Amino acid sequence: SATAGSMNAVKDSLQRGQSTIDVALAAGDTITDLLGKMKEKALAASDTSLNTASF
Amino acid sequence: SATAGSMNAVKDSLQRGQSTIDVALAAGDTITDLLGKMKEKALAASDTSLNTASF
């Protein structure tokens, strides 16, 4: 009965880790969006046709 | 007749020992529940993901 009643702490630790991973995945989605946008900005800046103010 | 009448003290001693053992068994039930709660506390505190306050 003691070993069976000890399981609640384990389940709580797993839910806590799942919540931390969810927050990390949300932050990673934001980082991926910003990364794609900077890749667009860099590919646009790489062209030699642009002038100084656009650059 | 003296040996037959002498047995009341023996019966009283056995009953007194049974009573003492019952008190010890109640205290042991309480100590067992407390030990199980301590196991749950230490097992919850083993996790590294907790912040200082919960620990």
Curated annotation (Swiss-Prot), chains A, B:
Coiled coil: none
The organism's place on the tree of life at top rank: Bacteria
Localization annotation: Secreted; Bacterial flagellum
Disulfide bonds: none
Subunit composition and interactions: In C.crescentus, the flagellar filament is composed of multiple flagellins of 29 kDa; 27 kDa and 25 kDa.
Stated family: Belongs to the bacterial flagellin family.
Function statement: Flagellin is the subunit protein which polymerizes to form the filaments of bacterial flagella.
Protein name: Flagellin FljM
Residues of the full protein shown: 56 to 110 of 273
